[PDB]
UniProtKB/Swiss-Prot annotation, chain B:
GO terms for molecular function: calcium channel inhibitor activity; calcium channel regulator activity; FK506 binding; peptidyl-prolyl cis-trans isomerase activity; signaling receptor binding; transmembrane transporter binding. The keyword Isomerase applies. GO terms for cellular component: calcium channel complex; cytoplasm; membrane; sarcoplasmic reticulum membrane; Z disc. Pfam families: FKBP_C. Inhibited by both FK506 and rapamycin. Keywords: Cytoplasm, Isomerase, Rotamase, Sarcoplasmic reticulum. This is Peptidyl-prolyl cis-trans isomerase FKBP1B. The gene is FKBP1B. The lineage of its organism: Eukaryota, Metazoa, Chordata, Craniata, Vertebrata. Signal peptide: none annotated. GO terms for biological process: 'de novo' protein folding; calcium-mediated signaling; insulin secretion involved in cellular response to glucose stimulus; negative regulation of calcium-mediated signaling; negative regulation of heart rate; negative regulation of insulin secretion involved in cellular response to glucose stimulus; negative regulation of release of sequestered calcium ion into cytosol; neuronal action potential propagation. Detected in heart muscle (at protein level). Isoform 1 and isoform 2 are ubiquitous with highest levels in brain and thymus. Has the potential to contribute to the immunosuppressive and toxic effects of FK506 and rapamycin. PPIases accelerate the folding of proteins. It catalyzes the cis-trans isomerization of proline imidic peptide bonds in oligopeptides.
Curated annotation (Swiss-Prot), chain D:
The calcium release channel activity resides in the C-terminal region while the remaining part of the protein constitutes the 'foot' structure spanning the junctional gap between the sarcoplasmic reticulum (SR) and the T-tubule. Pore opening is mediated via the cytoplasmic calcium-binding domains that mediate a small rotation of the channel-forming transmembrane regions that then leads to channel opening. Binding of [3H]ryanodine indicates that the heterozygous channel is activated by Ca(2+) concentrations 4-fold lower than normal. Single-cell analysis of cotransfected cells shows a significantly increased resting cytoplasmic Ca(2+) level and a significantly reduced luminal Ca(2+) level. The N-terminus is blocked. Channel activity is modulated by phosphorylation. This is Ryanodine receptor 1. Cytosolic calcium-activated calcium channel that mediates the release of Ca(2+) from the sarcoplasmic reticulum into the cytosol and thereby plays a key role in triggering muscle contraction following depolarization of T-tubules. Repeated very high-level exercise increases the open probability of the channel and leads to Ca(2+) leaking into the cytoplasm. Can also mediate the release of Ca(2+) from intracellular stores in neurons, and may thereby promote prolonged Ca(2+) signaling in the brain. Required for normal embryonic development of muscle fibers and skeletal muscle. It comes from the Eukaryota. Signal peptide: none annotated. Homotetramer. Can also form heterotetramers with RYR2. Identified in a complex composed of RYR1, PDE4D, PKA, FKBP1A and protein phosphatase 1 (PP1). Repeated very high-level exercise decreases interaction with PDE4D and protein phosphatase 1 (PP1). Interacts with CALM; CALM with bound calcium inhibits the RYR1 channel activity. Interacts with S100A1. Interacts with FKBP1A; this stabilizes the closed conformation of the channel. Interacts with CACNA1S; interaction with CACNA1S is important for activation of the RYR1 channel. Interacts with CACNB1. It is found in: Sarcoplasmic reticulum membrane. Detected in skeletal muscle (at protein level). Fast- or slow-twitch skeletal muscle.
Length: 194, 107, 97, 377, 755
């Protein structure tokens, strides 16, 4: 799975999505033994090849955009074509996030790496000794939990003057807040086990 | 410019005419001694109809001079069959042709 | 428009069949076969090394699953620019999860 | 001249620099703030200096008398190892000339054409400078660094050979006194025998992982020897040597002592060039314009292995050069089979003119049928 | 000398071994022209004589089998293989009787799967066409370079099976010199021929019932000779066995979908008839209760597809049922769907006695008793058992390629299907001038078949729009404008794409998704007429009203960057004709802007979200405006056009496009203001009750002064008299772009209407 992610540089196609789904299943719970094997290989191959992908991939993750929301809010105004099976896409949710089923797993994968208070990944992710260059995922994730924060606060102003939030104003809203909770869980697991 | 030399006698009386089918179970060679076509190997009697010019003129005018059952030797000048360009991939340009031709039935 | 839509009983037979199949994606997409998931890794992989083997010296013959994964590792290391689709990889990646 | 560039030369030998402190002992010690030092370009073999008026010019290794170079590092605007201070990637050192006390930054005078054309800027030692230098350092000390001094040594040994060879371009020898300055022959034969071994392709018995790992470390170095010339250079040697036809007898008016060492020198270049082309794809595209030149000879009594192999490796990768054969190159290689006997190697090459990887071309998949096929000899 | 002694030379054989490889290479991916010229060279007889011959050097004549398979076949196998994915089926009386072996008695309902492949398939496939070689025929000067070589298929079929009959018996007997030298030369070249003949279906009923008898003990004996899957084999013939077993999986799949079509006929018939009975029960006859009319709403309202959902939901559902049907037609589904979910894989809680058990139990044995090298092999069998373990997965991934049609139209579709094949063979071959001709008639005959107008759902399932798309990208792929080789074919094909996009809404969506792909290689090759890829890009959204809302900004941003180019270039191709080319080209600009007009409005001055970002983005690059105005030197509001008028009647200045240059200048600025007259904020529905749109109105009004604009509507050239004018100068027909520019920006108000 480390070899498969490294090959895919920065393209978030169906390749890594079906691969990251696997990686959660091997190392659920704590699974101390499987973490040890993964660390040994990274210390053995001693090529970068992989942290480039993680750093680049998560910078392409989406946030709660507001312009795209308006495009739904009038497209949903229509109910059926002249005569063609009504709106076939129906929900057509791909717009505001189109990624929550995926970007929620990337952070979960990182969190489960530093589970059980392992004090080698919790130090390795900060700086990679040897090799040629370092990435420092720690500071590379906090930046994401700042653009997302600027997005929710932006969304609040759009609803500041209204009085009741319509049904489609909550379905997308709960999507974003669920993602933010998952990010917060990870940040704790780089610090737990001082 | 075609030359005909009988090899075995035939009927000598019935000759093909226009609007009649002819079957030729022949073989063909080149002037230098290599053969590049045959019908006995495929074991299918080649059939053709005179008058509509679906065959090289030399061959048809040669066959017009023989009777039923006759096997003969035919020699076409290069100017009458694939004169300059020839048929690409089988015959060289400006080559003499040799044919071993016999007629099965139907005049 | 909605007020002028056509009744079902005037449609040609050939056209009134294609709509049936496309609409009758409501008995496969919801039904679950399960089956190949737990019986897969059971008969494959585990119990793969049966009594067929007669003798050994130092190592052991890789069991059927072991060939599969190394093949994906083999094609992963192939020097290429961008990974292809290889839906076959998707079919086995999901069932391993 | 000195310039700036984005993520294009970052994987190239051009952007490599070497730091040479002024001391003779402990030169390899830790580098600390406030310490005079020099800067050297590795493949160019030259330093950097500002003498009087020409600017930050890359001066040679003969006019760098510790006053024109005189560089050091500043934070802002010992018979031992020493205190380790300057880190990799985050030290944010500032470059400053010692004698002139200036600061280095980019002039960046860009007209309308320059903005949309070349994305290049010129660096100058301004008196006050800009506020966006923050020059941090990255370490690349690996197999490629060893294959950096090789470029300077080989490129400095080759052109001198041709230049010396070029002197007697058209002067028949005044039998007796052969020429003026002599020529090196033992040096080059050893030199060429190294690169062919150096560029020798990966073996066969090795496993996949080791084979794949080295396959990445060979393609890079093959491309690394193209950006610094060395394809024109090996081409240039062939142009000069191939003037002397027949045998060493016509090469007599160059020094008869070197005549008997003619065949091997002519040979050794060709399989060297095959190493620079085999496998790699980018280098193969360069021969589209030079396709007519390689196909021209195909006849020298001592070229048989060289030419048939160099031609074989350029028609296996690039389909573009495959489309630049009109009517006469096909009959030339056809005549090769007619003069050098029954050789399965040539017949294999004709199969390359056929279908390429997936795609097939019909503009030439009839000429061989009408040229080498109808005749039955 | 004799061929048989080349086994003892080892050097003359090596040369001749490569020789027959050239002939395999000369016959490229379809070259019926030069293929026949080899027939006079190699043979027609000794190939058929090389089969029974046994004394064999190896890499020699055993390699002839790869030449016999190259000069007579894969002229249809390469095409018929592509035909195996879609499963078009017509309404036929034969189709009306298809089930799970209905001569089964009790146990035969839940067993007796039937031998895989017997007959009755009713699928639509083009027939093979072949021609006999004749080199004495008259000189031609129709068929593409020719139709195909011929061969007696009847002799090959019997001979091949008889030959393989020896193989099984001779393998069990053992030897110290097998035919060819080493076992695998005695197997791989001969059964590879069997596989190629099998896909064409030359064998029929009786014949395939014998090839199954080569694995007799399990598959055969529906009512000694050990099976091929009994003995140890090298690591090459095992690969071929997979290629043979793979052909039988989809044969069951092809049988599977036909069974559904059979059920998709009689059940829909009674459904339509019973629904009419449901009408008259609740029709005008009716009764009372008022609200019952509200309940009966599907029966006249909702589109027909919606009705199917309501009436089919409860049938195969569980427990809860709403608006049900009579409990007489809801029983066969619970039997058929039960019957279907007993055949494929479902258990629904020794001798394999089934193909599913046979393959699954066998592939595992091969891995347990060997460490398989040659990665190309291991990828083969692992694609098998996955299919035999996920039956419904293959079925669910096959229905979107299935379609039913009616008689009296199969003949029309037959021509379309056969004609479409030649396009697929065009992609693999590199573009040739003779091949370029072939497609133009090919596509020209496509748009006359009476079937590419009635069933658009077919053409997205066959997806020829996908295949034709690569045809354009290959020819246009080039470094610069100099690589415009093979023109007159992009125009001849891009016209077909536009009409495809104007047949249905779903047709518009399916090709719209490639908009980013299309624009990437569209704004380079400009200069021809008729059509260009930019036109079909514009036609991809013209009246959708929801596709326009589904833009992604970056598409609009990147096309604008193209327009930045035509504001500073000089059109070197235009210059190549020896033209002034002073500062910029209006020809290129008038094409990009024409596209933007179709993305600001869709139907009567609407959709402003994308319109709003257009003006805010276009202003960022001031060079987008023609340098005659909106610059630092001067503007010449009524002078820039007047300057064009001066050059209009100046033949010397001009270029000494195909008409003149002044008209091109007039075309640009008139078209630009046309864009910024419909990119207006909105109608007064928003401008009279909001304060956001007023910001945009102030911007655009500040760029076009009204004083110059009012004066521009004047000075018509002339009128024909005594002798008409020419459409080469600044006309007056295209001056209405300034009329809409004032009708919806400044508008009439006081009494200036008199002026």
């Amino acid at each position: 799975v480390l070899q498969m992610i490294s090959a895919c540089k920065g393209e978030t196609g169906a390749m890594v999505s079906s691969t990251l789904k696997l990686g959660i299943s091997i190392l659920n719970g704590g699974n101390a033994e499987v973490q040890q094997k993964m660390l040994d290989y990274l210390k053995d191959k001693k090529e970068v090849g992989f942290f480039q992908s993680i750093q680049a991939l998560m910078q392409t993750c989406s946030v709660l955009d507001l312009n795209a929301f308006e495009r739904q809010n009038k497209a949903e105004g229509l109910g059926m074509v002249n005569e063609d099976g009504t709106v076939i896409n129906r929900q057509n949710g791909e717009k505001v996030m189109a990624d929550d089923e995926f970007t929620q797993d990337l952070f979960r994968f990182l969190q489960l790496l530093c589970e059980g208070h392992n004090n080698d990944f919790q130090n390795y992710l900060r700086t990679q000794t040897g090799n040629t260059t370092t990435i420092n995922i720690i500071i590379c994730t906090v930046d994401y939990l700042l653009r997302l924060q600027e997005s929710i606060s932006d969304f609040y102003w759009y609803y500041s003057g209204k009085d009741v939030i319509e049904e489609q104003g909550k379905r997308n809203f709960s999507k974003a807040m669920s993602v933010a909770k998952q990010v917060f869980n990870s940040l704790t697991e780089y610090i737990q086990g001082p | 410019g075609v030359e005909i030399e009988t090899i075995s006698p035939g009927d000598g009386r019935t000759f093909p005419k226009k609007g009649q089918t002819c079957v030729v179970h022949y073989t063909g060679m080149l002037q230098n001694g290599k053969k590049f076509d045959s019908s006995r190997d495929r074991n299918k009697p080649f059939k053709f109809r005179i008058g509509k010019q679906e065959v090289i003129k030399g061959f048809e005018e040669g066959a017009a001079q023989m009777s039923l059952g006759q096997r003969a030797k035919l020699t076409c000048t290069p100017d009458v069959a694939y004169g300059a360009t020839g048929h690409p991939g089988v015959i060289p340009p400006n080559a003499t042709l040799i044919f071993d031709v016999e007629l099965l039935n139907l005049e | 428009a909605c007020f002028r839509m056509t009744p079902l009983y005037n449609l040609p037979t050939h056209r009134a069949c294609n709509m049936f199949l496309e609409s009758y994606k409501a008995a496969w997409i919801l039904t679950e076969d399960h089956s190949f998931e737990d019986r897969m890794i059971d008969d494959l992989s585990k119990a793969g090394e049966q009594e067929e083997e007669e003798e050994e010296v130092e190592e052991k013959k890789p069991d059927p699953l072991h060939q599969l994964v190394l093949h994906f590792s083999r094609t992963a290391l192939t020097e290429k620019s961008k990974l292809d689709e290889d839906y076959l990889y998707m079919a086995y990646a999901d069932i391993m999860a | 001249l000195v310039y700036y560039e984005g993520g294009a030369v970052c994987t190239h030998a051009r952007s490599l620099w070497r730091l040479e402190p002024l001391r003779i002992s402990w030169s390899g010690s830790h580098l600390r703030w406030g310490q005079p030092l020099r800067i050297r370009h590795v493949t160019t073999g030259r330093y950097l200096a500002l003498t009087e008026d020409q600017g930050l010019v890359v001066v040679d290794a003969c006019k760098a008398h510790t006053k024109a170079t005189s560089f050091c590092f500043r934070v802002s605007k010992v018979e031992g190892m020493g205190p380790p201070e300057i880190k990799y990637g985050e030290s944010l050192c500032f470059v400053q000339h010692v004698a002139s006390g200036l600061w280095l930054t980019y002039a960046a005078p860009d007209p309308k054409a320059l903005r949309l054309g070349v994305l290049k800027k010129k660096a100058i030692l301004h008196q006050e400078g800009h506020m966006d230098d923050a020059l941090f350092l990255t370490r690349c000390q690996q197999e490629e660094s060893q294959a950096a001094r090789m470029i300077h040594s080989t490129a400095g040994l080759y052109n001198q050979f041709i230049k010396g060879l070029d002197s007697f371009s058209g002067k028949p020898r005044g039998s007796g006194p052969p020429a003026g300055p002599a020529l090196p022959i033992e040096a080059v034969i050893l030199s060429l025998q190294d690169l062919i071994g150096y560029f020798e392709p990966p073996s066969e018995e090795l496993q996949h992982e080791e084979k794949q790992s080295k396959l990445r470390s060979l393609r890079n170095r093959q491309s690394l020897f193209q950006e610094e010339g060395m394809l024109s250079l090996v081409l240039n040697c062939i142009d000069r040597l191939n003037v002397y036809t027949t045998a060493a007898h016509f090469a007599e008016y160059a020094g008869e002592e070197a005549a008997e060492s003619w065949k091997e020198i002519v040979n050794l270049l060709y399989e060297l060039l095959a190493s620079l082309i085999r496998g790699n794809r980018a280098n193969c595209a360069l021969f589209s314009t030079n396709l007519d030149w390689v196909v021209s000879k195909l006849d020298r009594l001592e070229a048989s292995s060289g030419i048939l192999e160099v031609l074989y490796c350029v028609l296996i990768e690039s389909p573009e050069v495959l489309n630049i054969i009109q009517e006469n190159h096909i009959k030339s290689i056809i005549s090769l089979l007619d003069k050098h006997g029954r050789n399965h190697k040539v017949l294999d090459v004709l199969c390359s003119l056929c279908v390429c990887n997936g795609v097939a071309v019909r503009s030439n998949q009839d000429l061989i049928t009408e040229n080498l096929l109808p005749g039955r000899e | 000398m004799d061929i048989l002694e080349l086994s003892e030379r080892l050097d003359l054989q090596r040369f001749h071994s490569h020789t027959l490889r050239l002939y395999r290479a000369v016959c490229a991916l379809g070259n019926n022209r030069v293929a026949h010229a080899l027939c006079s060279h190699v043979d027609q007889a000794q190939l058929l004589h090389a089969l029974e011959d046994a004394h064999l050097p190896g890499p020699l004549r055993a390699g002839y089998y790869d030449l016999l398979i190259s000069i007579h076949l894969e002229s249809a196998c390469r095409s018929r293989r592509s035909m195996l994915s879609e499963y078009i089926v017509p309404l036929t009386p034969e189709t009306r009787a298809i089930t799970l072996f209905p001569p089964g008695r009790k146990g035969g309902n839940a067993r007796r799967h039937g031998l895989p492949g017997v007959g009755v398939t009713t699928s639509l496939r083009p027939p093979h066409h072949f021609s006999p070689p004749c080199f004495v025929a008259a000189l031609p000067a129709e068929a593409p370079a020719r139709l195909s070589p011929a061969i007696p298929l009847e002799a090959l079929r019997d001979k091949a099976l008889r030959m393989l009959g020896e193989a099984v018996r001779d393998g069990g007997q053992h030897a110290r010199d097998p035919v060819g030298g080493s076992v695998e030369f005695q197997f791989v070249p001969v059964l590879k021929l069997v596989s190629t003949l099998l896909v064409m279906g030359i064998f029929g009923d009786e014949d395939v019932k014998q090839i199954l008898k080569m694995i007799e003990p399990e598959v055969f004996t529906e009512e000694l000779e050990e099976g091929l899957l009994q003995m140890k084999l090298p690591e090459s013939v095992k690969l071929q066995m997979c290629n043979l077993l793979e052909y039988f999986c989809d044969q069951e799949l092809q049988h599977r979908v036909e069974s559904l079509a059979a059920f998709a006929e009689r059940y829909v018939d009674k459904l339509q008839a019973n629904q009419r009975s449901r009408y008259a029960l609740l029709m005008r006859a009716f009764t009372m209760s008022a609200a019952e009319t509200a309940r009966r709403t599907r029966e006249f309202r909702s589109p027909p597809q919606e009705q199917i959902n309501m009436l089919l939901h409860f049938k195969d559902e569980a427990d809860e049922e709403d608006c049900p049907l009579p409990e007489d037609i809801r029983q066969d589904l619970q039997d058929f769907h039960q019957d279907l979910l007993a055949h494929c894989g479902i258990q629904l809680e020794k001798k394999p006695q089934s193909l599913q058990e046979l393959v699954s139990h066998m592939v595992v044995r091969w891995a347990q008793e060997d460490y398989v090298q040659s990665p190309e092999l291991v990828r083969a069998m692992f694609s098998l058992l996955h299919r035999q373990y996920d039956g419904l997965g293959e079925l669910l991934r096959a229905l979107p390629r299935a379609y039913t049609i009616s008689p009296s139209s199969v003949e029309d579709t037959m021509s379309l299907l056969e004609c479409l094949g030649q396009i697929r063979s065009l992609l693999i071959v590199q573009m040739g001038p003779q091949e370029e001709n072939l497609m133009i008639q090919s596509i020209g005959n496509i748009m006359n078949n009476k079937v590419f107008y009635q069933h658009p759902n077919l053409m997205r399932a066959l997806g020829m729009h996908e295949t034709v798309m690569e045809v354009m990208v290959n020819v246009l792929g080039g470094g610069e404008t100099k690589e415009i080789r093979f023109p007159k074919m992009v125009t001849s094909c891009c016209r077909f794409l536009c009409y495809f996009c104007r047949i249905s809404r779903q047709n518009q969506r399916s090709m719209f998704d490639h908009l980013s792909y299309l624009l990437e290689n569209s704004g380079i090759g400009l200069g021809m007429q008729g059509s260009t890829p930019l036109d079909v890009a514009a036609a991809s959204v013209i009246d959708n009203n929801e596709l326009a809302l589904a833009l992604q900004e970056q598409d609009l941003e990147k096309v604008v960057s193209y327009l930045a180019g035509c504001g500073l270039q000089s059109c070197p191709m235009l210059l190549a004709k020896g033209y002034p080319d002073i500062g910029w080209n209006p020809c290129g600009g008038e094409r990009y802007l024409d596209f933007l007009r179709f993305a600001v409005f869709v139907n009567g001055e609407s959709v402003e979200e994308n319109a709003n970002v257009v003006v805010r983005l276009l202003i960022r690059k001031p060079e987008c405006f023609g340098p005659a105005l909106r610059g630092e030197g001067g503007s010449g509001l009524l002078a820039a056009i007047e300057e064009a008028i001066r050059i209009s009647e100046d033949p010397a200045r001009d270029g000494p496009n195909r008409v003149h240059l002044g008209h091109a200048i007039m075309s640009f600025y008139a078209a630009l203001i046309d864009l910024l007259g419909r990119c207006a904020p909105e109608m007064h529905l928003i401008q009279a009750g909001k304060g956001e749109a007023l910001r945009i109105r102030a911007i655009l009004r500040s760029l076009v002064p009204l004083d110059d604009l009012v004066g521009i509507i004047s000075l018509p050239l002339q009128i024909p008299t005594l002798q008409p004018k020419m459409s080469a100068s600044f006309v007056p027909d295209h001056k209405a772009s300034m009329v809409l520019f004032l009708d919806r920006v400044y508008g009439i108000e006081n009494q200036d209407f008199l002026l």
